[PDB]
Amino acid sequence: NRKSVTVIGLGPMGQAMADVFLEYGYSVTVWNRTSSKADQLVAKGAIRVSTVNEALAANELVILSLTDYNVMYSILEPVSENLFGKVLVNLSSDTPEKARKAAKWLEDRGARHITGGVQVPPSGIGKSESYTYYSGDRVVFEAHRETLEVLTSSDYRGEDPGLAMLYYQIQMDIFWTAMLSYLHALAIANANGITAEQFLPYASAMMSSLPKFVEFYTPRLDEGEHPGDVDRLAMGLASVEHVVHTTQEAGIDIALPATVLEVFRRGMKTGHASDSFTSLIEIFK
Amino acid sequence: RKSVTVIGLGPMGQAMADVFLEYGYSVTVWNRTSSKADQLVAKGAIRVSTVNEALAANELVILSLTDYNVMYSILEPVSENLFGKVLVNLSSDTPEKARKAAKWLEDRGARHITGGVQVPPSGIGKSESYTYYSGDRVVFEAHRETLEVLTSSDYRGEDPGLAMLYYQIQMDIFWTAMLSYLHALAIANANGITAEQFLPYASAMMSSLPKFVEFYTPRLDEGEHPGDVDRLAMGLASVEHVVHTTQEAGIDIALPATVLEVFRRGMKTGHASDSFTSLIEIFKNS
Numbered sequence: 136n137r138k139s140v141t142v143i144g145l146g147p148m149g150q151a152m153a154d155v156f157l158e159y160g161y162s163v164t165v166w167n168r169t170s171s172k173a174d175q176l177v178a179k180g181a182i183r184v185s186t187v188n189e190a191l192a193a194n195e196l197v198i199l200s201l202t203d204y205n206v207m208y209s210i211l212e213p214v215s216e217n218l219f220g221k222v223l224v225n226l227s228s229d230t231p232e233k234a235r236k237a238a239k240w241l242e243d244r245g246a247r248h249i250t251g252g253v254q255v256p257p258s259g260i261g262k263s264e265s266y267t268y269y270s271g272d273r274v275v276f277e278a279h280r281e282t283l284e285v286l287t288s289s290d291y292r293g294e295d296p297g298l299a300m301l302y303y304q305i306q307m308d309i310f311w312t313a314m315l316s317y318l319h320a321l322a323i324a325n326a327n328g329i330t331a332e333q334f335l336p337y338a339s340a341m342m343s344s345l346p347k348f349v350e351f352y353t354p355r356l357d358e359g360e361h362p363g364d365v366d367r368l369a370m371g372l373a374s375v376e377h378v379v380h381t382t383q384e385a386g387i388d389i390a391l392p393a394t395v396l397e398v399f400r401r402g403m404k405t406g407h408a409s410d411s412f413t414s415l416i417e418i419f420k
Numbered sequence: 421r422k423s424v425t426v427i428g429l430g431p432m433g434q435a436m437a438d439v440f441l442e443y444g445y446s447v448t449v450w451n452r453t454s455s456k457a458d459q460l461v462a463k464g465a466i467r468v469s470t471v472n473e474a475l476a477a478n479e480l481v482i483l484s485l486t487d488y489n490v491m492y493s494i495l496e497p498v499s500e501n502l503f504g505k506v507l508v509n510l511s512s513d514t515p516e517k518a519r520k521a522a523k524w525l526e527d528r529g530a531r532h533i534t535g536g537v538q539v540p541p542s543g544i545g546k547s548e549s550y551t552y553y554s555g556d557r558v559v560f561e562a563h564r565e566t567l568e569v570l571t572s573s574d575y576r577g578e579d580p581g582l583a584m585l586y587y588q589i590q591m592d593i594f595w596t597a598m599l600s601y602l603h604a605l606a607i608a609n610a611n612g613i614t615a616e617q618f619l620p621y622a623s624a625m626m627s628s629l630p631k632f633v634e635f636y637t638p639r640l641d642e643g644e645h646p647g648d649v650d651r652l653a654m655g656l657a658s659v660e661h662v663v664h665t666t667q668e669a670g671i672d673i674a675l676p677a678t679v680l681e682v683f684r685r686g687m688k689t690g691h692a693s694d695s696f697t698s699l700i701e702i703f704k705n706s
């Protein structure tokens with residue numbers, strides 16, 4: 136542990152990471168594209184450099200917190216000859232394939248790449264209850280783990296550099312879709328004269344019940360089996376239709392439940408009326 | 421403990437009549453197809469030939485029918501015989517359908533309790549089972565004891581539409597969130613990961629959602645969407661990465677593309693710096 140690191144990206148996330156590194160006695164060199172002054176970090180000892188060239192020269196270990204992978208290419212391609220021997224830990228959220236391609240591009244330039252998917256907002260940096268998904272070369276990960284674990288606990292998922300972004304993105308698919316379904320349901324409730332406070336225990340109970348369904352179906356899904364022994368797709372379809380009609384009667388936007396309804400209807404069209412609604416995964420595949 | 425009529429002898433109606441018989445009720449039954457009642461008759465149910473006889477038997481009439489249309493079909497021709505009856509409608513439908521049925525029944529001198537049964541027929545007779553009820557509170561309280569032989573009750577208020585409202589808005593979450601789980605699982609499968617591998621992470625995300633609902637509840641009730649903990653523009657970018665992840669994995673795009681278009685509509689109406697909760701305005705409008 137050299138206790139020396141560069142942080143490229145000084146939005147809220149990058150700043151919280153630099154702050155914790157300073158607290159633990161690291162030398163911290165910082166840079167970003169808009170030349171933020173970072174006055175509070177500097178007063179705590181951060182070294183603000185002018186260019187990305189200087190930022191990369193400062194340290195072997197470079198933590199990136201950027202908008203996405205395209206930014207990484209923009210800023211690094213012009214300094215591609217300066218990457219030899221560097222370890223880049225990219226904490227930027229993007230796709231699994233972007234992470235894989237970046238890892239190879241860096242390796243071709245003599246650098247090593249670790250992918251991280253931070254699961255917490257900036258306020259969770261420095262807390263051991265916080266987790267980040269990691270993936271990439273295991274020897275490179277173990278060499279820098281101690282530093283990474285000053286920021287959060289680690290969940291190392293495997294050697295494939297895309298895996299940390301895979302686990303991150305599939306959880307966000309659930310997050311955003313389920314939360315928008317709550318807001319849609321709430322809009323219906325509000326049109327009918329009930330408040331969010333009134334809905335709260337029922338929205339919460341339904342959400343908290345979902346893992347039991349996931350636990351039930353998991354082993355069936357892994358066998359590719361959709362028998363209609365506890366539920367049938369045709370009955371599910373009828374249930375969805377009532378949600379759609381309830382939506383329309385309330386004057387609420389139909390797009391979200393109508394998309395749910397179209398998925399069900401495609402499963403019916405391809406012969407699954409008597410199978411479990413889990414058969415709809417075949418539509419998604 | 422006393423006496424009740426069950427009209428409609430599908431699986432739900434049969435399970436309810438059965439539990440009433442077990443608890444010592446005198447049970448009168450009718451169905452358009454007479455023979456559906458044979459097992460119940462052997463157990464002591466009184467089958468009657470006509471709807472008139474079934475209505476005459478008791479004050480309390482459970483309508484375990486397949487649709488509200490069936491109610492109109494069988495009761496309209498006998499509309500003069502409904503004074504003093506209390507009809508408990510268990511068909512799943514919209515809040516407005518329950519309201520229109522209640523008013524129709526009141527115009528003929530009857531009263532209407534809406535029920536939203538949350539369990540399959542196998543859950544009838546179990547106290548862990550709940551049914552949502554709504555309609556006149558005095559009518560509901562007069563019959564609560566009998567209704568609670570079937571399941572525990574959750575009375576939601578005087579509007580007959582409320583029992584259906586609470587049921588349908590919970591199903592909006594159920595189906596949309598469970599499809600998003602299947603969708604996410606399909607992406608994971610395309611990258612070599614199993615449902616067993618995804619399980620604790622899917623579970624953990626789902627279990628975290630009530631904490632977000634609790635956080636945003638009081639803000640939503642104030643109509644406040646400040647961007648102090650989250651900004652819509654950042655949400656949009658996050659959704660765009662989910663869409664890309666999906667396309668790269670060769671998985672069907674329709675579900676996350678719909679989410680993305682909601683976010684884009686909020687952006688294009690001037691909400692870049694507000695909380696994503698501001699998207700309730702998009703749902704409200706349209």
Ligand SMILES: [Mg+2]
Binds near residue numbers: 143166167
């Ligand atoms: Mg930057």
